[PDB]
Design a protein around this ligand. Sequence first.
Ligand SMILES: C[C@H]1CCC[C@H](C[C@H]2Cc3cc(O)cc(O)c3C(=O)O2)O1
Ligand SMILES: N[C@@H](CCCC[NH3+])C(=O)O
Length: 487
Amino acid sequence: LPEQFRIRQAKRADLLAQGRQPYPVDVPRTHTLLEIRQAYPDLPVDARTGEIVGVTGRVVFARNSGKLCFATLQEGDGTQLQAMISLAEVGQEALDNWKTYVDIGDIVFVHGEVITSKRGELSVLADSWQMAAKALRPLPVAHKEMSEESRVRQRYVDLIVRDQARKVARQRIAVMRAIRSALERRGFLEVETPMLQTLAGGAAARPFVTHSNALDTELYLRIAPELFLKRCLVGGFERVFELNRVFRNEGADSTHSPEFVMLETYQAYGTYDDSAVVTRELIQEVADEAIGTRQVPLPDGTVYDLDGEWESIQMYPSLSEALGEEITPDTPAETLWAIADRLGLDIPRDRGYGHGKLVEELWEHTVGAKLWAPTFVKDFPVETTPLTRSHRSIPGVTEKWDLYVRRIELATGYSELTDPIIQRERFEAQARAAAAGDDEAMALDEDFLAALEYGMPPSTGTGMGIDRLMMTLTGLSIRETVLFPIV
Ligand SMILES: C[C@H]1CCC[C@H](C[C@H]2Cc3cc(O)cc(O)c3C(=O)O2)O1
Ligand SMILES: N[C@@H](CCCC[NH3+])C(=O)O
């Protein structure tokens, strides 16, 4: 209500004018609420510990009584501790000022003795209090459920009233630190590649376009750091990774956010067989450090098993077994069109899709849509993997694996294409498909090609959406894993 806004304004202006400071520069804070609970786990009722402390906390519940005022204080992590304002300890005016100015939502400083109530509630028997932050907007009423849209628009309020919001936010922080600790112990170095690029590449997505005033030209927010992380391989970096933001200006839904966080690792003198092992162990180690179990709990009550080895299937024979028909890279595109036409699959015909795109959409409808447990699918068509090296022995296939978890693409990994001549052909075929109506096709990068011509060692690289890693570990939506998603 707007009347409650001016009521809290009058309390603030009256407090400020009368010499009291509703927003002081500091308060003699000596203890947190958490260390007081840990220092006194069990205490009998009516106990005077004698420990004189000075604590702070947001008032989330207040109960007025004649000579004794009760108030529940809550600090940042959710730890709670009761405040006791009695006439016998704070005096008359300090008691009356508490009833006059303190409202629910205010951040207050309370100095006193750690005691337990007659009911056994661990409290701080105050002898003097002070306003730390006079709140002008009251917190939502108790158990007034915040809508899903309100939780995003006001995450700061969501972190005060909902314990699930604090746990998920602290879980994401633990995941980001677990990824760094797990990669750094393997010899990987975290590097930084530019987010403002002159030509967006390294993935298949539409970029954000902006204007530079220093260069007087159009720049692009990066969709992937792949092309610049490959420059580090040519430069000498053997084990390198980047864990930061990427911008893909496309549609947003339950699994896509235009601004999101990725992980890209690159390991010299290793193949995609080695990167699939690192990615599996990394995810399993992140689950241990951030959740405490590889059988993670899901919001529906079920438990998802992430431990042990994971199934690895090849894409062409898995589609062959699912169809009951031999499908090879030699299978003509017209055959795959007729197979997709019989299956009722809707694939656009004005986009220049050929053999490679048809096998991908056929595998998803027959194999990918049925997976649930962590499963790798490897050996992809050459047309849909421009930055991936051809297979060492199987013709027509490339050395790329895809990691699906609960019907969600979590990670990918290539045996990196180091041949500059073949890489130029891949770019020519991509720009060929873009001229055929494929807006997702990549563009030829002369600067990246020139970097390859100096010699890039045989290496393997990975990519993983950290936001989808949070969805895998927690089961929450993609917007719930972000503190402030711009929606
Ligand atoms: C870095 C990549 C490679 C591994 C799979 C995963 C795909 C990626 C696609 C993608 C595109 C997009 O526009 C918005 C998004 O949030 C994502 C995402 O989370 O996942 O992450
Ligand atoms: N650039 C890839 C991730 C790296 C793949 C391995 N080189 C992507 O955005 O999907």
